[PDB]
Amino acid sequence: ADNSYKMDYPEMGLCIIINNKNTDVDAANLRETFRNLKYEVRNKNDLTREEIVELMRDVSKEDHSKRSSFVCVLLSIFGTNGPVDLKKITNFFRGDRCRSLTGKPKLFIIQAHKIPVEADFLYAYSTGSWFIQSLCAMLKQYADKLEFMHILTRVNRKVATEFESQIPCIVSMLTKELYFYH
Amino acid sequence: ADNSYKMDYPEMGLCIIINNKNSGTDVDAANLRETFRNLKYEVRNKNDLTREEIVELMRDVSKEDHSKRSSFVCVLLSHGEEGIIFGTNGPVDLKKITNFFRGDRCRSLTGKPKLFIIQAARKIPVEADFLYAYSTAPRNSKDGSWFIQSLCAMLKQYADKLEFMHILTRVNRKVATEFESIPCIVSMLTKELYFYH
């Protein structure tokens, strides 16, 4: 069982949902979904690029010692003020930078410069929305069954199917399997 | 039941190994040969191809009849900076290599997994049913590269039980462990990939 992530901590973790439409059907759908997964959902709206950096920096300083993971959802990446480099956001949660989340998975769900390749990180981005509505539907049905890569794979098939009648992208640097149950 | 790729075709598929060494990477190629050979793949071997010879190679393969084949694997072993894939004369753009195997372009490999294992010794094309196992670690090693030898060991042990993503996940954990004393996975697969039927 050392091939899986430790998801039996007192909590599950934070679920920062940053909404930059200026997607609300998705933001609420993501909220209700991750709340059932016992996460600590925090919905943000129309944050400038300086505010996004400020937020993610303060979260890195938080105590995630009781939290299992960290989920960040970006819907726009572009801030309302300008374009943010994804690296500027991820650097805070780098293994050595954030000691509290070291060894824990950091999920970045993005709905729209190289991509940060750091351990225990994950990017599932597509370019309400079909990607989010299907992801919530898969997390609602297969979170207590399938591993997260298998869940994201069903999303890839479901979205591609919808396009038949372009496909989401999974960037995995996880070192262990991820199950949303214990 | 349509959650796993159809892997019971008469043939498992092709496995192109491009060894641009210009040793360590020679052990990589020798290990990748034995590994995919036991996985019942048709392994074709190339050595020190120019960046044009690579493109026309993938061009010819895409024009073959993979109707009786389950999948397609392409292992790229190159070196140098400013890029991820290199010929003996310059860097190759993955955008040009993968375009031949798009669903509309390649009828034979439509709905089938195309695996591209890339090792780059020192813009990603997003297409359905494609996967890129990308590593970057900086010649005389008796074992060879870390990512390759870990991939071959994890495949020769867990292909009978684990799905490809779970195999690559354990490869990530092993290469990252050696760093203490990380490979990148880009997956657009629509189904699960098991190397058995």
| Cβ–Cβ gap B182/A156 under 8 Å | no
| Radius of gyration of chain A, Cα coordinates, nearest whole angstrom | 15
**CATH number assigned to the domain with residue range B1-197, chosen from the 4 options 3.40.50.1460, 3.40.50.150, 3.30.70.580, 3.40.50.1110:** 3.40.50.1460
Alpha-carbon gap, residue A59 to B58, rounded angstroms? 46
Contact A153 B124 (CB under 8 A): no
Q: What count of residues does chain B have?
A: 197
A39 CA: distance to closest CA in chain B (Å):
24
Distance from CA of A60 to the nearest CA of B (A): 22
Structure determined by = X-ray
Interface test with chain A among B84, B118, B150, B173, by most A beta carbons within 10 Å = B173
Q: What is the DSSP string of chain B?
A: -TTB----SSEEEEEEEEE-----HHHHHHHHHHHHHHTT-EEEEEES--HHHHHHHHHHHHTS-GGGEEEEEEEEEEE-SSSS-B-SSSBPPHHHHHGGGSTTT-STTTTS-EEEEEEEE------TTEEEEEE------SS--HHHHHHHHHHHHHTTTS-HHHHHHHHHHHHHHHHH---EEEE--SSB--S--
Q: What is the dihedral of CA B59, B130, B192, B31, to 10 degrees?
A: 60
Contact B185 A175 (CB under 8 A): no
Best to test chain A binding among B82, B102, B126 (most A CBs inside 10 Å): B126
Q: Enter the DSSP assignment of A69.
A: E
Write down the CATH number for the domain with range A1-182: 3.40.50.1460
CA–CA gap between residue A119 and residue A173 (Å, rounded): 5
A154 CB neighbours in chain B (<8 A) are: 3
User: Which chain A residue is nearest to residue B168, measuring alpha carbons?
Assistant: A175
| Residues of chain A neighbouring B163 (CB-CB closer than 8 A) | 150
Closest CA to B127 of B83, B186, B68: B186
- Min Cα distance A88 → chain B (Å) is 19
Of chain A, the end-to-end C-alpha distance in Å amounts to: 11
Q: Which residues of B touch A (CB under 8 A)?
A: 3, 124, 126-128, 136, 163, 165-166, 168-170, 172-173, 176, 182-192
| Alpha carbon distances (Å) from B187 to B58, B104, B155 | 20, 19, 18
Q: Name, in order, each residue with C-beta under 8 angstroms of A122's C-beta and a sequence gap of 6 or more.
A: A105, A106, A107, A108, A148, A170, A171, A172, A173, A174
Parse chain B into domains and list their residue ranges: 1-197
Please report, as a single letter, which amino acid is at residue B9: Y
Test A153 with B172 for CB contact under 8 angstroms: no
Q: CA–CA separation, B189 vs A168, rounded Å?
A: 10
Q: Using a CB-CB distance cutoff of 8 angstroms, which residues of chain B are in contact with residue A176?
A: 169, 173
- Return the ∠ at Cα A170 (arms to A165 and A173), rounded to 5°: 170
> Which residue among A147, A156, A173 places its CB closest to the CB of B172?
A173
DSSP string of B63-110, one letter each residue: TS-GGGEEEEEEEEEEE-SSSS-B-SSSBPPHHHHHGGGSTTT-STTT
Q: Do residues B78 and B20 touch, judged by C-beta distance below 8 A?
A: yes
Query: What distance in Å separates residue A8's CA from the closest CA in chain B?
Result: 20
- Residue among B124, B169, B191 minimizing CB distance to A153: B191
Q: For B139-161, b where at least 16 C-beta lie within 10 A, e where not — what string?
A: eeeeebbbbbbbbbebbeebbee
Cα separation of B72 and A57, whole Å?
A: 43
Residues of chain A that touch chain B, judged by Cβ-Cβ distance less than 8 Å? 3, 117-119, 127, 147, 149-150, 152-154, 156-157, 160, 166-177
d(C-alpha B48, C-alpha B46), whole Å: 7
Q: What is the resolution of this structure in A?
A: 2.9
CA A139/CA A33 separation, integer angstroms: 7
Report how far residue A119's alpha carbon sits from residue B79's, in angstroms, rounded to the nearest whole number.
23
Question: How far apart are the C-alpha atoms of B158 and B174, rounded to whole Å?
Answer: 14
Residue of A nearest to B83 (CA): A114
